[PDB]
Amino acid sequence: GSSGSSGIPGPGFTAGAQGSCSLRCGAQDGLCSCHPTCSGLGTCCEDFLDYCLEILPSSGSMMGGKDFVVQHLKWTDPSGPSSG
């Protein structure tokens, strides 16, 4: 038997131009990320790969294998209207 509202507004930090992986290549940020998981998320830095283009773990090759194929199309049916 309650509803309330509640609210706790935080202040503004305001950092500015940031998000570099020069001496990182293993961190997570908001603007970007120097983590290899940034791939799954999508917060990789623009210079993350440039500076971390060889930080990822071993990338095996050949494991399974699967393919697909499909193609079909057809539709025919004339008509004949009339009037009176």
Side-chain angles (χ1 to χ4, degrees), residues 45-67:
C45 333
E46 251 252 70
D47 331 306
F48 160 67
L49 264 172
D50 247 49
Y51 267 129
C52 331
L53 244 152
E54 202 142 43
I55 69 152
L56 301 113
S58 220
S59 182
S61 237
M62 238 191 244
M63 253 191 89
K66 249 145 138 241
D67 209 29

Side-chain angles (χ1 to χ4, degrees), residues 3-21:
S3 242
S5 259
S6 209
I8 55 138
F13 289 126
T14 288
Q18 255 282 290
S20 44
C21 302

